């Protein structure tokens, strides 16, 4: 099995003790590690700021200390949105800059590939041409990769994308029977499935559905989301969950009514390290609980979640880690993608249960090993 574990550029930019840097990761955690993000302009990769170089030499580093890990530079993300890749997929020439770019950029930096992360071709003002573009990209760039290994006698460079969770955008969106032909992997963003438009708290991140959840609710879950994938095409040993290392927050309307489904006023608010409103890393949960929260394991969909007076909180421990990390085994799946590494207890000081404490579970639980290591 795969560990793929992503490393954001803002997490160092957090209070000191929340603060992330590459040189704070085991080299010999995970298999893959991801740099969230590279940007664009000109229809070129680039870098986003000038202390991005310095973070790619630290993390591209620690392949000294694993010499069977591999690093994978992601482009795009929710912020930056489809226009950037609209613009760059609508001509031959467009693509052609963009995948000469990429192979220039992986290949001075020591990069092992890249993940595509378009939110979404099809979707979000991308027009329905895009899920035909998206796949016509992704095959020109597998060709050229393949092209590049032979000509220069080396390895040839990896390529992934991210896959949405949400039904409606993977119709939209994604060609799934060519993409997986000619990708690597696909890192399925099974998180974020809260639902927070519906008025009552959900999960972000559930095994299983809600004996509560109606409709298109019922497929907001890992086992559907996967389900759907593998029956629309893609290859099992080629698909990555997303394993989310935070939770979402709600403020409850009765701080009496505190269950899954219970009705809600707004998302809660930020937490003092990541500073997202609805959002709260791995690492605050633990905050949050040693300060007095209520902690309910929720057995339909084999997720926690917690509360403290009207605000509640829906996320991922270890024993959903190891749930999940035994249903994954059990559908021959490809792996497990830590999404971000920077909001796991990388310290081990605020949930004391030693350092990455979800991540080194699925390590374990994974079988992960690398000779070096």
Same mark, same amino acid.
């Given at each position: 099995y ?8 803002w997490?160092?930019?957090r209070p ?12 010999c ?9 590279a ?6 990769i680039?870098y ?11 993390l ?12 994978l ?24 800059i ?8 992986l290949? @001075?930096?020591?990069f ?10 099809g979707?979000?003002?991308s ?11 992704v095959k ?5 990769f393949?092209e590049?290994?032979v000509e220069?006698?080396i ?7 991210t ?49 509560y959840?109606i409709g298109?609710?019922?497929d907001?879950?890992?086992?559907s ?11 099992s040993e080629k698909?990555?969950?997303?394993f989310?290392?935070?939770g979402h ?37 633990c905050?949050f ?11 339909? @969909? ?6 403290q ?30 999404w971000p590494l920077?909001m796991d207890?990388f ?5 004391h ?5 979800l ?13 070096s290591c």
């Amino acid at each position: 099995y795969q560990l793929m574990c992503y490393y954001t550029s803002w997490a160092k930019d957090r209070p000191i003790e929340g603060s992330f840097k590459p040189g704070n990761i085991d080299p010999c955690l995970c298999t893959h590690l991801i740099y969230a993000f590279a940007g664009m302009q000109n229809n070129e990769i680039t870098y986003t700021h000038e202390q991005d170089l310095r973070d790619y030499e630290a993390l591209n580093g620690l392949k000294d200390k694993n010499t069977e890990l591999k690093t994978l530079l992601a482009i795009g993300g929710w912020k930056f949105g489809p226009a950037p890749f609209s613009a760059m997929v609508s001509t031959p020439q467009n693509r052609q800059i963009f995948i000469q770019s990429v192979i220039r950029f992986l290949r @001075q930096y020591n990069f092992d590939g890249l993940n595509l992360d378009w939110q979404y071709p099809g979707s979000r003002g991308s027009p329905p041409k895009d899920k035909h573009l998206f796949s016509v990209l992704v095959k020109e760039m597998r060709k050229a990769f393949e092209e590049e290994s032979v000509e220069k006698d080396i390895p040839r460079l990896l390529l992934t994308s991210t896959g949405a969770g949400i039904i409606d955008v993977i119709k939209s969106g994604y060609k799934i029977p060519e993409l997986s032909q000619s990708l690597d992997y696909i890192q399925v963003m099974t998180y974020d499935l809260h639902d927070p438009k519906d008025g009552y708290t959900g999960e972000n991140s559930p095994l299983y559905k809600s004996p509560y959840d109606i409709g298109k609710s019922a497929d907001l879950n890992v086992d559907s989301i996967i389900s759907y994938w593998k029956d629309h095409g893609a290859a099992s040993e080629k698909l990555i969950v997303g394993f989310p290392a935070y939770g979402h927050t709600f403020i409850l309307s009765d701080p009496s009514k505190t269950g899954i489904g219970a009705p809600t006023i707004s998302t809660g608010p930020p937490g003092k390290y990541t500073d997202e409103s609805g959002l709260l890393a791995y690492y605050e949960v633990c905050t949050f609980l040693n300060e007095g929260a209520t902690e309910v394991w929720d057995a339909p @969909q084999e997720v926690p979640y917690a509360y403290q007076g009207n605000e509640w909180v829906g996320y991922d421990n270890v024993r959903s880690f190891k749930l999940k990390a035994q249903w994954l085994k059990d559908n021959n799946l490809g792996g497990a993608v830590v999404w971000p590494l920077d909001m796991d207890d990388f310290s081990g000081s605020f949930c004391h249960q030693r350092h990455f404490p979800l991540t080194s579970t699925l390590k374990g639980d994974l079988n992960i090993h690398s000779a070096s290591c």
